[model samples]
Target: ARKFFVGGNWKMNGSKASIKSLVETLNASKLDNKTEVVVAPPAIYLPQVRQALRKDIQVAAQNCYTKASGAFTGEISPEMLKDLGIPWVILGHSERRHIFGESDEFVAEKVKYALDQGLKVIACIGETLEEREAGKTMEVCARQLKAIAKKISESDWSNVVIAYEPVWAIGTGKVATPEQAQEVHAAIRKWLAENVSAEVAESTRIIYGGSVNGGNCAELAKQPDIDGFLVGGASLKPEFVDIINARK
Candidate 1:
């Protein structure tokens, strides 16, 4: 069975003081041993966060460049992330796709290169409000996964955790009802079984994200297919611990 996983995407938020306080609480909190918890901070704070955060709680980068080293100004590579001992990267986030125009193929390259450099990935895939209304949610997510599958070998999937955070729900106070979330998660699992391997499908985690908070996480945790969550704004607050221990 897959272990439950919870991740915090700090995004562009938090100053050093704010992060320092947050880490202090996380270090002291009693997180569940059964859950695999990771927190992704901005690249600028990677080193500091990794160093100050508790060892039990892993650290990740919000994003990374596809190339190891290049003239791409304002970009950091998976090589640097590996060198800094950052274990994971959250790729293909809805914000990146909608705002920065990162295509599915581009995200695939990012995922492949990051894994090649030895950093794990929390690969995000989801549909927009329009797509969901048009009943194209899984179609969009599958296309996103297909692009990623084409770039990486079957073995590489062991290091990938899929986070389904619909674009419309993210940071907008809307969340996928447990039933709605489970339907897509179940489909994704089936998709993996067919396209990849049954072992990967069973072993790999498929976590939900999008306005996940302390209040609603318990109900979401009850879903058979939802392995855990990728919390956004609530991740910055102390309430994240409750979400982390939602199953408990």
Candidate 2:
């Protein structure tokens, strides 16, 4: 069976003190082992968060740099993350693309470098409202994936988790309808099957991200291709746990 996973993107929010209580809550809470849980805290708190988190739950860095090391101030690299025991690093988050000026090419480079350094990647890709309006959602997503797909072998995607977080939907309280999400997800899966292989397409988890909350999560989880979620704002509260158990 395809492994189900849920990731919480705590984008630059929360204090060190709050994180302690948050980790305690998750440690005591009952969640399905059927779902793999990952939480991405801000880079500043990643090591401390990993040390405190339950052994079963994984921690991811919000972002990482493409280069292994050298004069890049204020940026962390995949090799450094691996050495620090941070197994996963989120790439191409809408925040990085829109707020921090990260390009698709930059994201693809990071993805390639992360795998090379033995760090798993949660690769984010999606379209904006204008692109969707112009009937180019699938095209946009395909173009983004094509950049990385060409750089890495099909088998290499096994270590990558694709998170679809539409820019218009992220942090805007505008969630994609189940059908809307499924349409794009289905297209992505078809692309993987044809370009990569059926095994790679079916095995790699294609998760949804973008205004995913308790109220709307269950519907999205029911979609066949939506293997899990990469949640944003809702992740800070108790409702975030409910979203994790959406499939149940």
Candidate 3:
């Protein structure tokens, strides 16, 4: 069985003051030790936030580059993340794919490079509203996974957590029902079972994401295949701590 995981994508939304308070709230609270936790902040605050948080709660970068060193402007590299002691990076977020024009190949490359450089990955994949409406959700997800699958070897999967956040759901007020979330999660697990070994399929944590709030968190955790969540804006709120305890 997979261990539960909850990640807060503190997505470029907080200032030093607000982030300080958010960290203060988290640090002051008791958390479920059995459940793994990570918080992503803007790259600029990685070291500051990393050193400040409780040792058990690690830091993640919102992103990093595929190359270790390059002329790539305004891009942080996995090399730097590793050097800074940042263990995780969120890649292929819907915004990165849609707004920043990061292709599947680009994200996959980033995932592979990050893993190779000794960094864990939160590899995000989901269909947009248009893709979902067209009934091609599985195709889109499979295509996205396949791109990364082609790049990484089977063993490298241990450091990866597949986050299924529907493009329409992420950052949008729209949310997926537990039934819908379970369906995709089950299907995606089966996809892993078929493409890779059942061991990898079973061991990899396929976490849910997008608009996961405290109210819905408990109900959603009831689903068997829902290993955990990758929360967005809610991560910055006190609700984030509640969601961490919701699984229990």
Candidate 4:
């Protein structure tokens, strides 16, 4: 079965005190241990967050470089993440794609290098508001997946979890309804079955992001294709725990 997976993207927020408090709450909560949980803290705080968080709740780097080591100043390489004993990295987030201008090829390069270094990846892909309005959501997603499929071996999919965060919905107080989310997720699964393999399609976890919160999580979680979440603002709030236990 595809295990339920929830990721908390702390984004550019948080201080040591705040993260410590979050860790304490997680430690105290009666989380459904069956779900797979991971939290992505800003790279600067990864070490401390890794140390503060319970071992069961794995920590991920928000982004990473394509090289093992280099003169790429201000870049964190997958090797560095691995050296720190961090096992997961989120690549190709919309911010990275839009604001920072990372192209599909660049994101694919990072994914390939990270996987080669044995780090699990939360590989994100989705359409922008305009693309969706143009009826090109799947077209855009297919192009994104094609970029990665070229860089990665079919076997590499086992280490990847896909996050479909619509650009329009991200932090916009807009969310894809459960049906809307499911429709796209189903398309992604179908794409995987045809482009990758049926086994990969069935086993890979495809989680949702973008305006996911306690109020909407339970219903979103009910969608067969909506596996879990990659929470943004809610990750810093108590409601994050509620989102985590959404499947319950």
**TM-scores for all predictions:** 0.99, 0.97, 0.98, 0.99
Q: Residue-wise lDDT of candidate 3 within 1-248, one digit each (tens)?
A: 68899999988788888989999999999899878999999988887798889989989999999888979999989989989999999999999999999999999999999999999999999998999999999999999999999999999999999999998998787779999899999999999999977998999999999789999999888898899999998998999998898777
Ranking by lDDT: 1, 4, 3, 2
What is the Å distance of residue 12 in model 2 from its true position? 0.6
For model 4, residues 54-122, the per-residue Cα lDDT tens digits are: 899999999999988889889998988989989999999999999999999999999999999999999
Local distance difference test, each candidate: 0.95, 0.89, 0.92, 0.94
Model 1, span 1-248: residue lDDT tens: 89999999998998999999999999999989999999998888888898898898999998999898979999999998888899899999999999999999999999999999999999999999999999999999899999999999999999999999999889999999999999999999999999999998998899999999999999999999999999999999999999999999
Q: Mind sharing the TM-score for model 2?
A: 0.97
How much is 16 displaced in model 1, in angstroms? 1.1
The collision pairs in model 3 are: none
| Candidate 2 lDDT tens digits, 5-116 | 8999998887889988888888888888799899998888888898998989899998988888999999998888888899998999887888889988989999999998
RMSD of 4: 0.7
Summing lDDT over every window of 10 consecutive residues in candidate 4, give the lowest-scoring window. 26-35
Against the true structure, candidate 3 reaches a TM-score of 0.98
Candidate 2: C-alpha lDDT? 0.89
